[PDB]
């Protein structure tokens, strides 16, 4: 059905994402049980980590495009990422390593993330009709790797320790790198322009220096979220006023403020929703005992199933509006399951969290795998900059929001935690319903501006 380099890219993406979500699924619980962080500390440090891991993606697009070439930057990013995973496994020996290891994952991801997609677009003639389907399968590849990692990582951590799980993430990256090396032939004629000139050792050294410096800057920020907050505050307000001073661009801006809300909500899956499932949900579904942390796997699961269907099955503003209503419903559903459908002991049925994740993953499809491609369509390297910047700000804000659900380590009674989660999840749902409704109010004038 598909070109030969498609399958290489599919499996490289699967394994890289497996490694990343192997870390993401266990990271908040690792902060709490292993480093002894309070839930508030863990939630804000996860917010900072995810902010860096996402805000740095623009660099890697630029480096693959103009400095080293897309194929070289895939190799470099995979190597830095694997190093980061093995470094995170090493930090169970040397705890003071953890932040440097996390910054190495961030920078690794920053270099790697944008590049396989770019490579994939180049495996097909310029408007080959199979591209829509090839990119849907690419997203499903991300989510198969993610599903395996989110399901299995917590089990592995429970039975073998974190060092083994982080090392297995590293291993997933080394097998992605091996699949790339053993299919190098498939992509000999596919790449960006620097890929085909000889490599510039000056630019390679510049990238390695910047990478290292930025590893240290990330480790610092993750250790001191209170100045990351101000760095991103002032950065946002100053790119706010650079933006404001330079009519289809005002559409990209409001679309971005809505993607911000979506990413605040997305940020809850490894933090507040994860601990909600730990604390206030039955850990038994269809008669099987599971690790509650594995519940995060319900999002990629619903994506893997829903993406072909939705591919089969207005324009830009309505799709974003529908995604926002869906995320609203996911949180109102969580709030309702706590308010009305809980046990005497304060525990709620896992089916309610299955529906929460279905809603949230529909929202993801409508908003997240759509905004970037067509925000560009409305619009350039500045908006790519400021888009990844606002999404980093969204993960910082998400960590701060998750802290309203943080449970002191001495609380043991689920009826004591149930009302906290339901208050926060319901207010998140009601605000995101308001936001979705003003989105819908604005959809017509938006659709006109896109003309």
């Amino acid at each position, epitope marked *: 059905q598909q070109p030969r380099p498609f399958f290489m890219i599919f499996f490289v993406e699967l394994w890289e994402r497996f490694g990343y979500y192997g870390v993401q699924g266990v990271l908040a619980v690792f902060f*709490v*049980k292993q480093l002894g962080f309070s839930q508030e500390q863990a939630f804000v440090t996860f917010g900072a980590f995810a902010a860096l891991v996402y805000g740095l993606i623009s660099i890697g697009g630029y480096v693959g495009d103009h400095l080293l070439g897309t194929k070289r930057t895939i190799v470099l990013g995979a190597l830095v990422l694997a190093i980061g995973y093995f470094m995170t496994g090493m930090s169970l020996l040397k705890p003071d390593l953890i932040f440097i290891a996390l910054g190495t994952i961030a920078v690794g991801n920053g270099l790697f993330k944008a590049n396989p997609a770019s490579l994939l677009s180049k495996c097909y003639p310029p408007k080959d009709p199979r591209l829509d389907g090839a990119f849907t399968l690419f997203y499903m590849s991300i989510n198969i790797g993610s599903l395996i990692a989110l399901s299995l990582a917590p089990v592995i951590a*429970d*039975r073998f*320790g974190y060092s083994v799980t982080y090392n297995l993430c590293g291993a997933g990256l080394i097998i992605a790198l091996l699949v790339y090396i053993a299919c190098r032939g498939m992509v000999k004629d596919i790449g960006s322009e620097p890929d085909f000139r000889p490599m510039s050792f000056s630019k390679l050294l510049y990238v390695l220096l910047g990478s290292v410096v930025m590893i240290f800057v990330c480790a610092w920020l993750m250790h001191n979220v209170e100045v990351a907050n101000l760095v991103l505050i002032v950065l946002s307000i100053v790119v706010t006023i650079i933006f404001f001073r330079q009519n289809k661009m005002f559409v990209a801006f409001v679309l971005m403020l809505e993607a911000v809300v979506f990413y605040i909500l997305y940020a809850q899956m490894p933090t507040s929703l994860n601990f909600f499932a*730990i*604390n*206030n949900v*039955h*850990h*038994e579904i269809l008669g099987f*005992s599971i*690790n*509650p*942390v594995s519940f995060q796997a319900l999002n990629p699961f619903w994506v893997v199933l829903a993406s072909p269907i939705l591919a089969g099955i207005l324009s830009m503003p309505m799709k974003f509006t529908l995604g926002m209503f869906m995320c609203s419903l996911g949180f109102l559903t969580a709030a309702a399951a706590g308010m009305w459908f809980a*046990d*005497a*002991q*304060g*525990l709620t049925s896992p089916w309610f969290i299955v529906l929460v994740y279905l809603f949230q993953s529909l929202g993801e499809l409508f908003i997240s795998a759509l905004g970037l491609a067509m925000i560009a369509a409305l619009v350039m390297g500045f908006i790519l900059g400021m888009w990844f910047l606002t999404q980093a700000a969204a993960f910082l804000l998400g960590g701060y929001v998750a802290t309203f659900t943080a*449970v002191p*380590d*001495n*609380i*043991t*009674d*689920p009826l004591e*935690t149930l009302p906290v989660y339901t208050n926060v999840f319901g207010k998140i749902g009601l605000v995101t319903l308001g936001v979705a409704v003003v989105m819908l109010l604005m959809v017509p004038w938006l659709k006109r501006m896109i003309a």
Partner: nanobody, 122 residues
Framework: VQLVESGGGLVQAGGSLRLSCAASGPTLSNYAVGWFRQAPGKEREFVAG???????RYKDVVKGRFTVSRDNVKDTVYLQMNSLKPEDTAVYYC?????????????????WGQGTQVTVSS
């Protein structure tokens, strides 16, 4: 996923016993451990537990008499029972649930030991 209790037995009113719960594969340190007891002709009831981060929960009748503690080098949880009374006579089960909650009913716990008999004679 399989826990083994140890340390039950027969003791005179006012004596002491120490129950221990151990786990096989999963590190017990990620788990709230609750001790339940079934007395003849009654339902399992929550006696006492410790969660994954040293929060404690007790049934009112056993406060100031029972102590739950945790050794996370031996991956083991203890129930020290002092001032034992005849009404403490029961089968004692340890049970394990991931995380920091100790819910009161057996349904909140996935993993269960087989049970040790504790008899307190007057």
């Amino acid at each position: 996923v399989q826990l083994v209790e140890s340390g039950g037995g027969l003791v005179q009113a006012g004596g002491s016993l120490r129950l221990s719960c151990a786990a096989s594969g999963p590190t017990l340190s990620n788990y709230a451990v609750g001790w339940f007891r079934q007395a003849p002709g009654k339902e399992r009831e929550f006696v006492a537990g410790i969660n994954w981060s040293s929060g404690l929960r007790y049934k009112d009748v056993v406060k100031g008499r029972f102590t739950v503690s945790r050794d996370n080098v031996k991956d083991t949880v203890y129930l020290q029972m002092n001032s034992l009374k005849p009404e403490d006579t029961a089968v004692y089960y340890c049970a394990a649930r991931f995380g920091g909650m100790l819910p009161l009913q057996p349904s909140g716990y996935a993993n269960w030991g087989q049970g040790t008999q504790v008899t307190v004679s007057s």
